[PDB]
Amino acid sequence: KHNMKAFLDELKAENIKKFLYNFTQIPHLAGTEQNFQLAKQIQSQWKEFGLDSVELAHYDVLLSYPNKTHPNYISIINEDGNEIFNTSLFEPPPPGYENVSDIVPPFSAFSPQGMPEGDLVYVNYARTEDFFKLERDMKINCSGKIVIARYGKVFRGNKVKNAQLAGAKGVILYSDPADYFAPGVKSYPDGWNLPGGGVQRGNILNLNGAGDPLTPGYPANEYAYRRGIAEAVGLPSIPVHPIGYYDAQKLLEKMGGSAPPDSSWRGSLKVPYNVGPGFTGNFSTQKVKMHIHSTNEVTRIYNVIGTLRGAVEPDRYVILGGHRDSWVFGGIDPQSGAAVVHEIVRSFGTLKKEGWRPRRTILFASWDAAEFGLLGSTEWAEENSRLLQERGVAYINADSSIEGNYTLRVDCTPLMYSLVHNLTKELKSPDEGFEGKSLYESWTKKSPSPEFSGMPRISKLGSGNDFEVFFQRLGIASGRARYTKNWETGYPLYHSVYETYELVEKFYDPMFKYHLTVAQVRGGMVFELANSIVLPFDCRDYAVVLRKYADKIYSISMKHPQEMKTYSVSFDSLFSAVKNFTEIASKFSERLQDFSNPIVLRMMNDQLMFLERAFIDPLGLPDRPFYRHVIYAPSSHNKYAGESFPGIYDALFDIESKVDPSKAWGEVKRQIYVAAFTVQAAAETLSEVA
Amino acid sequence: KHNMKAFLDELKAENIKKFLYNFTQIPHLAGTEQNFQLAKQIQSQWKEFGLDSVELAHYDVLLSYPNKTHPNYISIINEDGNEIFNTSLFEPPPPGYENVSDIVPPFSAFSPQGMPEGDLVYVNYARTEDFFKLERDMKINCSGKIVIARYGKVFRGNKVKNAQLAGAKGVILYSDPADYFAPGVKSYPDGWNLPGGGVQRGNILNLNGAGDPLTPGYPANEYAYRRGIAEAVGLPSIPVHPIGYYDAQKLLEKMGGSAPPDSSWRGSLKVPYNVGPGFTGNFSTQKVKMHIHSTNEVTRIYNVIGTLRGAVEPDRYVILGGHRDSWVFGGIDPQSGAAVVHEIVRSFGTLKKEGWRPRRTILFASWDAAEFGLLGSTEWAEENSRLLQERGVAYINADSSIEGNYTLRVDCTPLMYSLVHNLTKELKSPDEGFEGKSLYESWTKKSPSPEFSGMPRISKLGSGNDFEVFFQRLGIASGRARYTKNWETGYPLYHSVYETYELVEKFYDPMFKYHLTVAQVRGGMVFELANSIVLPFDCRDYAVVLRKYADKIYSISMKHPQEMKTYSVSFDSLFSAVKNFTEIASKFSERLQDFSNPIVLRMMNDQLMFLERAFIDPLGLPDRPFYRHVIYAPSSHNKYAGESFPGIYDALFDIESKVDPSKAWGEVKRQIYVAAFTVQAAAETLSEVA
């Protein structure tokens, strides 16, 4: 038989290991020859594996690179203009790689050039709440200052956006051991902790889902008309550079001015964590100077797109995609994901060579330039948006398979909750102490649901990964799964040169059993979405969460009862809409269970497929035209986090500070109307069609 | 048998006549009790006729009405502030109706209040070219003036928009006998010409497809959050009032200043048609004073929505819709259309009572408030947009069935050209001298195609009618057909109190044979769209027109060869896209002809249905977010006319006057890229799906 169990049994830990080794011997930075060579290799291998067609889809997009002959660095500058301390020009390379060529030194992609000279202010994580604390409580003025911020808690671009708007002329980002050095664990190469010379790379764009900064809305193809740099989307306006904690210590140790307001502002370094501005009396006349010479350059990128044509519904697409580009070796990010995708393609291909085809078409994607702002997946979706929104059933992402070895982590639409629960009950747990038990059992024990007994935690989707354009712009049901760490007690080497094959094989997953379990979850999801007669979506699960989200947004508003009285702010329409969605979903599920008629089936499969699509508003969210999903959007304060009813949430955020409360509460009421209307309209897609 | 011929044979001229009489005895102005009573009657009758369900869909939208106790009028005002002449307070009512209550006096809907006093400038038709001539050639300054313009040639709102931007403080609109009095024909009631006391009503909004000015994007339902009047969409900012030619003569006869530049500026009145500004020397000290007291008021409107559920594909909708609201009696506009819709519903119902159902669902609509800006159809489409864009096969409009008695007029998407040609070859011509000949033969003889021998003229769609939201915002294939006049040699009584049943029965269509022929065309189109196994769309016809439109836009650009050299403006991408569309459409048509498999059929019917949808750009046209179709949009100078490649056309329009030619030609290049990309993307929807 060719059923799911046949597909799953063909997946092998040893193959995943072989592929991971093969993908991580040299750097694969977006836009470089080595990453084009890897694209060609994967294209060739996916053809060998048995896919019907495998093509490269290329685009010419804005990328950013350091200048090879004028390196980026930061200085402490004395009274005379002598540079008395300089940060590192590169991370000490890991053992055995000290002669590998073309390792990109640490930099912040898309930083402008500049050499700003100034006094530091230390801004904790540079979160919006951290800036509120500085300015409103401590009365510290960031205007004209260089801010030094520690990484962690939110996406780094959001930090830079916050720093900009606070008036800063530069940002130094660093990794504090409080956030990236786990107690009792050795630094790389003898454990998985971050050494003092390690540095986290990463882009600092604020694109809000636009993709290539020069071509928002349209693919960056050969005839594309590009915005000028001055009109580009999302580019930072102040120089930015990341450093390690050895170099950060040398910068923080002289900080004067105000004490930290409290212990949540102190990291683990042996420094005062003084907020500034400026250094203590002896060194009051020294300043910090940035030297940033990186250049933005339109560069060709390549996606690999593999097709396994459906036997019955070839015009319905289930997509498994993850990126291929890495900052350096990509040991975890993304090659632990890409190796899993490669073995999934191999397994589907094995079944295909034996005469099997899935019911629906499966598309497999190896995306380029994800590290520079999800550029490869976004340009491809812009090029193919008409096909995807009329044919796209689901998107399963496949970036890093592991970020820890403790338990499963799943983030997905409520439409896939039942599918995930059912699949994980049929898979074996890889965990110690759970041998012979299901993955559902181990996951639920380690990561319990906050609301329900005997259920696991599943998170929302925001951004930060290649599902973003599919889910937040186009409204295609999306999910992701990986193995993760224990939060109760990014990983330390994230985006550093130390993310290697050896890191994974020695410290994360020596037997590749966690990788195998992730391959079974992602591959299993794809198999069920592409083969189940009725799409494996349960609309009643959306109804349950919509009520939770409506309760939660109402509770936020109810912090301001006088204003709700004054401006007549009612959530009655939104609760009515959610109640109607609940009733209609219940009736639809009865019909689905109770309907030989392939027209009624496909009519009902179309109602299932277009249900996620119904939460899209074609006008987008306010000043964010490419975030269109009314229920979820990436948080306006943290791209990594999903926010529910984002339009209403943003209208309420810090509302007590708004200068015209009538207008502000009017906008809250407008967002309640948009949300209530969208929920009711989605509900009505599930009604009998005529 | 229940086939098309059975449907068509059941339609009767005598029933159309009976219904037209029934619909036109009292006024049915949007928002009034009489028009709600008619909605209830139609709902009841459509139920009786056999529809599965018939509901009222209501919305609360901005309407505009005169003040019953402070009437609108225009004055000539002397030096002392004595009003020496006043325009009429109402049109003399037609014979037998002089005691009918609730006739709305002539007014311009949505005019603001005001009493501006000034000197006139006569602006011909107030077209953009007329304003160019005044300002650039004659150096006449409209700032602070009351402009008097004649109706005709373009939609009246576009006139008011032009007048506003020229700085005017008021607009007087009038009907010149050159445009509304056919030579040798008697005035109403003794012929179909416009009498001197007749006045054309009509709204003067510039909504650009938004629908209700207070709720753009979302239905004006019970919980809607409304913009303030100051933020409303499309409202004119200067007072506007329409008058007849007896009253216009009294205003024009004193005009001084400059002579008309040429004979195309002179109408038929016995006046000089002097452009002004102001009156001749004897009366130089007199001014014109407007008195406008109309009020905008949120008012409930009602659409009737009838459903005939499909037997095989109930989730595919073919829509026949036209409006019900009229300015006064609606003898032609819209009741000549609504009477045809009523007989079509009756005929489909007859077949339904005998056990027949169409293959796909047919929706029938009686729209409200079309006269106030297509409000009823637009709010309904906003409410149901998710259902329509995933299920909508086609929209056939049904406003006035006649505007003349000479020949057929069809405006539609190229996807319906073959369907119309085939249907009209099977229908009998109603025309004198063509007895026993087909309607195709008579139409083609009277209205030949410009480009092809032995083919009829079919026009493009713009706006001005209720197909606008379906076609231009949502991308649902749309069409319209009516009987029209001979252009080689609006109709005179358009939007006047003289549009009565007697007008039609005595002067336009005494036997109701032209109405019957229109019922066969519209009803026949609906029958074929709702019943044909394969959708009756021919993608190759789109390929032919796209090449014509690309040739035409290139020719416009080629008026500026130096600039195209300087800024490297190439249309190569657009021609490549059109060539690819041609090739792919040809291959798709081969597969369609050559494919027992209902999945392949429906897959291919989905490719046909979503082909119009592929021409929608989710970002809309520049500053017009609700006009989304890249191939067609209503002209930016005349809402009634369709324009092809509107984005490029507007970027080229008057480009030689732009102050920064680099930026202007950059925008032309951007629009060429958007157009080329959209054509290629539409083409790719017709490729094999996997």
Ligand SMILES: *[C@@H]1O[C@H](CO)[C@@H](O[C@@H]2O[C@H](CO)[C@@H](O[C@@H]3O[C@H](CO)[C@@H](O)[C@H](O[C@H]4O[C@H](CO)[C@@H](O)[C@H](O)[C@@H]4O)[C@@H]3O)[C@H](O)[C@H]2NC(C)=O)[C@H](O)[C@H]1NC(C)=O
């Ligand atoms: C959830 O689904 C329910 C349907 O089960 C749906 O109920 C609808 O609610 C609206 C109210 O928002 C009802 O609207 C009424 O319709 C009648 C005509 O049928 C009108 O006469 C009413 O207007 C009068 O009363 C108003 C309220 O006091 C006044 O503001 C107004 O000026 C009039 O005097 C009113 O429009 C509608 O009938 C029902 N439909 C039903 C029961 O089938 C509810 O709206 C759905 N929720 C959401 C968020 O969509």
Ligand SMILES: *[C@@H]1O[C@H](CO)[C@@H](O[C@@H]2O[C@H](CO)[C@@H](O[C@@H]3O[C@H](CO)[C@@H](O)[C@H](O[C@H]4O[C@H](CO)[C@@H](O)[C@H](O)[C@@H]4O)[C@@H]3O)[C@H](O)[C@H]2NC(C)=O)[C@H](O)[C@H]1NC(C)=O
């Ligand atoms: C109409 O359909 C045809 C397909 O039949 C399609 O042809 C495509 O055209 C593009 C050109 O716009 C081709 O792009 C080339 O792709 C190759 C790789 O396959 C690249 O190496 C090429 O880039 C080099 O050359 C460029 C031009 O001088 C340079 O600008 C560039 O820097 C590189 O040196 C180039 O990208 C593409 O291969 C074909 N696809 C085919 C033939 O299958 C055409 O685009 C379609 N029309 C529209 C409007 O979409």
Ligand SMILES: *[C@@H]1O[C@H](CO)[C@@H](O[C@@H]2O[C@H](CO)[C@@H](O)[C@H](O)[C@H]2NC(C)=O)[C@H](O)[C@H]1NC(C)=O
């Ligand atoms: C990664 O694996 C690929 C696939 O086996 C290797 O590429 C092959 O290399 C051999 C011998 O050098 C060639 O004969 C084949 O043509 C290649 N096949 C391809 C590209 O599909 C590649 O060498 C491996 N890389 C590493 C670092 O081990």
Ligand SMILES: *[C@@H]1O[C@H](CO)[C@@H](O[C@@H]2O[C@H](CO)[C@@H](O)[C@H](O)[C@H]2NC(C)=O)[C@H](O)[C@H]1NC(C)=O
């Ligand atoms: C930090 O780096 C800078 C740049 O390389 C060093 O400054 C340069 O030193 C060289 C060697 O003497 C001189 O030729 C240049 O004139 C210097 N450039 C300057 C001062 O801007 C600097 O000495 C380094 N500091 C430390 C502590 O290594």
Ligand SMILES: *[C@@H]1O[C@H](CO)[C@@H](O[C@@H]2O[C@H](CO)[C@@H](O)[C@H](O)[C@H]2NC(C)=O)[C@H](O)[C@H]1NC(C)=O
């Ligand atoms: C997950 O598994 C459950 C348990 O089998 C499925 O629920 C059953 O579905 C069948 C077929 O429709 C019904 O006959 C049963 O009554 C259901 N049992 C329940 C609800 O306890 C469920 O459909 C699966 N989810 C998927 C496939 O997405």
Ligand SMILES: *[C@@H]1O[C@H](CO)[C@@H](O[C@@H]2O[C@H](CO)[C@@H](O)[C@H](O)[C@H]2NC(C)=O)[C@H](O)[C@H]1NC(C)=O
């Ligand atoms: C238009 O026709 C309708 C439908 O026949 C007439 O309405 C009917 O009037 C009769 C007698 O007055 C009532 O018994 C029915 O209940 C009505 N039927 C409906 C409303 O569906 C209406 O009178 C006609 N109007 C004119 C002006 O002739």
Ligand SMILES: *[C@@H]1O[C@H](CO)[C@@H](O[C@@H]2O[C@H](CO)[C@@H](O)[C@H](O)[C@H]2NC(C)=O)[C@H](O)[C@H]1NC(C)=O
């Ligand atoms: C035009 O209409 C106005 C408004 O009705 C007339 O002016 C009014 O005349 C009455 C009757 O004598 C006076 O009571 C008001 O004081 C007048 N209002 C004014 C002058 O603003 C005016 O006479 C009419 N002109 C003609 C020629 O009929």
Ligand SMILES: *[C@@H]1O[C@H](CO)[C@@H](O[C@@H]2O[C@H](CO)[C@@H](O)[C@H](O)[C@H]2NC(C)=O)[C@H](O)[C@H]1NC(C)=O
């Ligand atoms: C209009 O009528 C023509 C003539 O019958 C149709 O074209 C024929 O379609 C059949 C069935 O696919 C083909 O076998 C013939 O070769 C076609 N004849 C031609 C092109 O001359 C055409 O499809 C009809 N258009 C519709 C139904 O939209």
Ligand SMILES: CCCCCCC[C@H](NC(=O)[C@H](CC(=O)O)NC(C)=O)C(=O)O
């Ligand atoms: C356009 C908004 C996102 C910015 C593009 C880079 C995205 C990149 N993503 C990542 O680095 C992701 C984050 C995650 O999903 O855990 N890393 C992994 C291991 O999945 C970044 O954070 O830098």
Ligand SMILES: CCCCCCC[C@H](NC(=O)[C@H](CC(=O)O)NC(C)=O)C(=O)O
């Ligand atoms: C929002 C843009 C259109 C404005 C709404 C009123 C539309 C109204 N339409 C009409 O009066 C139409 C015009 C036509 O299609 O021939 N009249 C008829 C007889 O069909 C108007 O012109 O006044």
Ligand SMILES: *[C@@H]1O[C@H](CO)[C@@H](O)[C@H](O)[C@H]1NC(C)=O
């Ligand atoms: C890189 O820096 C060198 C000098 O170190 C300079 O000559 C060159 O212009 C730069 N490269 C760029 C900007 O691409």
Ligand SMILES: *[C@@H]1O[C@H](CO)[C@@H](O)[C@H](O)[C@H]1NC(C)=O
């Ligand atoms: C912060 O300091 C600078 C002094 O350079 C000043 O110009 C700016 O307005 C200040 N912002 C405040 C006080 O909010």
Ligand SMILES: *[C@@H]1O[C@H](CO)[C@@H](O)[C@H](O)[C@H]1NC(C)=O
């Ligand atoms: C793998 O799990 C073990 C046991 O809990 C632990 O000692 C080790 O630190 C884990 N590795 C990582 C990278 O979390």
Ligand SMILES: *[C@@H]1O[C@H](CO)[C@@H](O)[C@H](O)[C@H]1NC(C)=O
């Ligand atoms: C209409 O005009 C009368 C006086 O003629 C005035 O009292 C009333 O306010 C007006 N009605 C409105 C503005 O609806």
Ligand SMILES: *[C@@H]1O[C@H](CO)[C@@H](O)[C@H](O)[C@H]1NC(C)=O
């Ligand atoms: C038109 O005339 C007015 C005089 O009231 C003037 O203010 C305005 O600027 C003029 N416009 C021109 C000359 O373009």
Ligand SMILES: *[C@@H]1O[C@H](CO)[C@@H](O)[C@H](O)[C@H]1NC(C)=O
């Ligand atoms: C109807 O057609 C006849 C004959 O050509 C013509 O005399 C009459 O004017 C037409 N009526 C209208 C309204 O065009």
